[model samples]
Target chain A: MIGYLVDVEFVWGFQARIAGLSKTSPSFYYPPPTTFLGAVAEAIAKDKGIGEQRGKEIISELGENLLAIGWKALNCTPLRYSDINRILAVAKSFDSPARGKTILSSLNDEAPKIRWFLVFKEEAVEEKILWKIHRIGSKESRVAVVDVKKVKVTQKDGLISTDYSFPAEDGVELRGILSQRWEFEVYLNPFEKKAVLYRIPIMTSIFSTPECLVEVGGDFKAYEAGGEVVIGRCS
Target chain B: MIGYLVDVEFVWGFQARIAGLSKTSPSFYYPPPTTFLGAVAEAIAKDKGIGKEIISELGENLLAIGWKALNCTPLRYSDINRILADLAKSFDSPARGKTILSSLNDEAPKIRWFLVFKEEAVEEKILWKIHRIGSKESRVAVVDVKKVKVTQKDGLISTDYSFPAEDGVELRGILSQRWEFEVYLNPFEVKMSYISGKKAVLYRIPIMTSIFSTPECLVEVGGDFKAYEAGGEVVIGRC
Candidate 1:
């Protein structure tokens, strides 16, 4: 197991719809592991100049082998406050296709940047895919793989910080298409969005060991690393 | 007046002795305004290669600088309580007469500071030259300075930035909120008197909200300083 620090900068701003709520969807502060993976897959597809089908194939092939320990926000930034009127004004003025008149949450201009860390199985394909991942979450956000110096894994305790979460514990959950049994959610590109079928755990806290097998394509494998189990990966 | 956001990261752990405590000096969580001013003075003095005589002149001219802390994260040592307890026990041991213990509240080693500046100051090159501030132990980087329009509000504002109470803002929530701590300044009593014949006062700054359950006192800034607070709402900075 190896570790890489990923720092994400929201240059313009970040937007996210709450998984369960509509007409009042709050902004998801941290992107789920699935989002990170999807972003990475997108970057790889762009780098290779491949079509969507091949991209999904590469994502599934890499997904089964790669393990995400979890991610955390490195800094704190206040969310932008908006009501129905402001939300509609923004949408109409910018020609945003958002259906709702209310924007649950948005980040302000003064908000600090966010950073996340991920661990992966030391495979050549995994490294290339991770290196190509320049953007994550919203289109404007940029992700970089920092701390590239290989860090040896001794035990899981050092890899875990104060933010790690466990199964059924507080601040843990599954959301988005990853929460669905048969549906797959392809993240939105600049002009359009797509959906795919896969299972990935959306956790509010840091990544940990897994107790189940995560479904990548049709195959399943444990997402656990160190002593903490990465959930939604095993049966 | 204009607002300039100041972000500082301490490469090493920050060290500030708690006020009015000796043989058991705990670490101070935030740097008082005087300390920041002194640091700025030191930086200026070094940049010009000047002595105290010139430094004092520069310090007096820089009084227009007013600061309000936007955010801070205090990282404490894990075994601090245990160390304090052990120190107390040592005082009762045979080396009681010779043993000394120091308290420390070493922060996460990285801190962010936001300062409000007069519009004219931002145009002046002196403001940008302030690449470093804070105690000698802390190497400060006056990171990014940008002008931001802010809205003014009137209420209790919880802040670690110490300023004169009579600066047109009333100090509220010190007694009501539990996070307030009174710290003694003037580390060098005789030096302070000798240099400019001044005495520092006991500062009653708000305890950072993260350390205490209740939020910091609510005070009002003219413009929108942050997202959570209203004109006079009670809000706490992570500090």
Candidate 2:
């Protein structure tokens, strides 16, 4: 079901614990680890330059790709800023959410939250694009595993720093220790039929920037023949 | 037509930034804010204990109550932690994850990134419960909204705190902060139809545990009676 190709790469999640901090940090404005919406917007703008139908198709696909990527990683999905406004309307009808009012209003600097992300170049797949997820917050930084359902989730401990070295193969990597073992149950979609291929980077990026940036590692796919069947629903 | 209660008052999305660190300062261990799953295990457990025949007839309705609550909150519809293990086993494929072999073997300490969350109390209706999503690592902290399709959904934000001004009142006075901006898109099954006329605190915390803490001001329902009446496919917005 490979329809069109645009671009795909891996990225790390942000976990900065600015619990009581008042000002926004510089990482909030930088690229690679944050501000992915800018890239998505750029991609859409580029597609629009082609034509009307193609642009619409590309836009729709972009959203779909996000859904796939989000579910595969965080087990949650994200919406555009505008759509967030609409969903809020429906929420207001149900619970008055007077509690959230203070939190949302206190967000004098809310934009930084969306800007925490990084681009990890795994492999430039022919059609599919994939990446791994990582986050760094307080003593809660560590590389997490997407285990099958019900498996115990382990959280290591450590501080945040780049002094540590990593394998020279992967393009991007996280080098933090974990703190707490936060467990959660994962659910898979039931709409998937065919085996999907993806490129999982065996490389690390704490030492180098341009090492094995998909320009080197070729893409791979997963289906019934090669899919690493997980402990969840097959969608 | 509140069919099945999928969820009510749940956290949708989250994000966070730390001091003296990069955007990647937060490690996977500590999620930024917190993402709250919409269902409570007790509900399902209770449903299951009630026996199959009665459960089958009431299950959808129970889920519907949850769905209505979730829709009315700031949280959007994303894949939830389908707490049922057997149900999660259908798609058992492993996609590529970012490598962490080196870091695990190392000894240095690192920062974290995650969404840390807690549940708030509902003042009136004890009809809903929260379920946490995520496998282990990729936990979303700042439960914001969900993707476009899910954003078109209407649900609860289920904030975990209360306003000091509205203490010891009714549940309707203590609704969440994000309840004003929700939208009701197409109608989904599992909704809330009837409630036993007993006006008890919607949230009830055990004497030794902290959960379902009810307040007088936070109890209210988020829904669109007009659009829901218009059609199953109606969308809620500023008309």
Candidate 3:
């Protein structure tokens, strides 16, 4: 098994629309699996000057190979303020609420960084391909991927901690395509004000940290029992 | 709608037997709603010196109240260590099956519980009596309880306060006992027999606390159906 530490820096503050809370929703603490995957695909597509169709193909290919997703926060940025009534008023005017800009309060001077982990099925896979990932979370956020040496870790290592979702949990719904049709306004060359039916993936799961841990810039380790990779911490 | 914050400290390292993973179970970052509710009920009964009859009534009353677990912040410990089961190993002088028990770092964190009632009259005195929480082994002290103001908005909510046993999750069997009556704990089933030979059925759904949100679950709470037009309200706790 192989692992890499994906370092992401939130540029102009981060915003992850929480599920159920409409447009005026407070941002989630970390990015979800689908968001991370989408960011990676977007980065690769931009680097290669590929079109939307090519980007989708690359993302689909990466999704199939993705074994587990884990993340750890290097900085603490808390959600500070939320005014439901104000947001409600804004929604009435704009048709939908928007991300709360005045909510997050970062504790450190440096921008917040989250070390995301992506596990793969092979040990000798190409490493150069991953270094191309330089974007994550929101569009403006930047990221870097570094392949770290793997170590054998168990409950004794004290190196593992859970921040978001544990790759091992059974009930977690992974990324997929959706059938919902949505309408939007398209403004381009020959501006067309009306937009029709569109299909997109309905991300069923939001951001969650579970039974795992990570140290920013730390080496990678895999917990294995017998011959197979053990996802959760084992005694 | 009213809100209450309950702060608890666990003396022993927290140990949450994850649903499907036995022996090698990972501790839950925060206590589930069912756990918090059960602990409060247990504490009240012991403090009042009440018998099984009182406990049943208390449980039923709590079920009726629109309870919501707002948020929980845990002082997590990342360290891990293992030791052999002393008693099990000592059972046989020469033969034994080795069992490695894993433990988490000891830290206490506060969990906030919100109870929404149709009526403005609150049960302040009774709710104040819940001074303890957690299982018998990890008896956590309910050190403080304070009222906090909150605003409401529509959002997705789990059917129950605790983890929901949805379609893809697995379930486990548990053995339960009551003083004068009988008790049986099964997945998605809660059966409690009272001392007066009366029985009531409650459903316990197993769910995990992840960063993600559950789908929308709209259900009737009390006689006043209009109390909550949309049940799930997103309340920001003391982060």
Candidate 4:
């Protein structure tokens, strides 16, 4: 019976990873043998009316070991923004939309695809304007010239804010105008003293959702245990 | 001028947070100063072929900061999501949509509202199980005995692994049905040692966004000096 349960658990992960492949793909998909076991073990322990602490200990140790294995086995690589930009450029150059679709699909399915995370970094610029101020005393033979400059003029310095306005791009031209402003403050900094802020005007358009919304999930035969089968879990 | 621009930026946030605050707010029947500046900055930046960053730094910064120190600030917080959720709950209770609308509109002109982020933490019960088996022959005999009187047996142990599953409730109910087996291995001592091989199955549910989205962008006003001076941005008519 235990052997049957183990087989079922393994198969579930195998199929699930494929079915939800797109959902967690190229990043988080991994063997869920332990997650399966922990859940079963928990159910069983609860049925037995065992102390919750013992169950927790079992799950904690089990989870850590399983996660360690996954982290060790499934290595991840960073997908740079530049690569995405290149793909977009290529898609534009393709002769037909179908051709672009084919190309993008092939490219996206590569061993790894990109995921972007935002980090705030602050960069500021300040400038001053100067003009010659000439002073002439009443009937003075010579006039003294002095340089006068505007004070360091600043708009707002603390947080970076953004607003979106249609630039009259040909394809996605503005119909009327839905004026919008987007403001955000990131808690973490990329490499600076300033907090990151991101604002995207809801009105702005880039590329619409692609035509093919692929359904990528996994398949498997999970073990079917009787009511309250205590799955073997490590501690 | 700066004050007007600042009000406009707040309006923008309101617009994005609420579906149609820009249209609803009487303060600006027309585009607010912030909106105008933003549009102008965007147009200028695009016309002169400058990045959004350049314009935001030079234009937005100056405008927002200029009004920061003002004695009377016009910015108002909408607490948009919370209010909407509360309204929804209230309407659900009595099915009074008109009263809800009336209540929402009853606020005075000078009144201001704020949005506060709320966080909640919940605890859940956890569980786990371990299996121990005795000698294979003896274990078989015990099973055959059928009598409730069970004797102890031992053997060698084999093990497998485990992981976390998210659950919501605390009360757990049931008796754990565990399959136990005992096998022979280097049996020498007066007592036998037992080893159990087992695996775990976790049922966990999690919630995440439906799909990935794009990042926002910003630009500066002086970032496009020429276009504004010329009265409008350079435009190529419908292709």
lDDT of 3 by residue, B51-107 (tens): 444334433333122222222222221111011002231222111111111111112
Descending-TM-score candidate ranking: 1, 3, 2, 4
- Evaluate residue A12 in candidate 2 and report its C-alpha lDDT on the 0 to 100 scale: 26
lDDT of 4 by residue, A1-235 (tens): 1111111101001111111223222211222222233333444345434466765664444323320010111111212112322343422221111110100010111111111111111101010100111111111101111221112111211112112111111122122222332212121112212222222122111222111111111220111122111111121
Taking the candidates in order, what DockQ does each have? 0.01, 0.02, 0.01, 0.01
lDDT of 1 by residue, B11-40 (tens): 323333332235222444456445554555
When summed lDDT is taken over every stretch of 10 residues in candidate 1 chain B, the lowest stretch is: B95-104
Please say which candidate is ahead in DockQ: 2 or 4: 2
TM-score (C-alpha, index-matched) for candidate 3: 0.30
- What DockQ number belongs to candidate 3? 0.01
Q: For every candidate, what is the interface RMSD in angstroms?
A: 23.2, 17.1, 23.1, 27.2
TM-score result, candidate 2: 0.22
Which ranges of candidate 3 are over 4 A from the true structure?
Answer: A16-27, A49-58, A80-105, A123-134, A141-164, A167-235, B1-239
| Winner by TM-score between candidate 3 and candidate 1 | 1
Model 3 C-alpha lDDT per residue in residues A155-192, reported as the tens digit of each score: 22223333333432222222321222111211111100
Order of the predicted models by lDDT, top scorer first? 1, 3, 2, 4
Docking class of 3: incorrect
lDDT string, candidate 1, A8-106, tens digits: 543222334332243222333344455666776677677655667876776676555554434433332222213221332322322222211111111
Alpha-carbon lDDT, every model:
0.36, 0.22, 0.34, 0.18
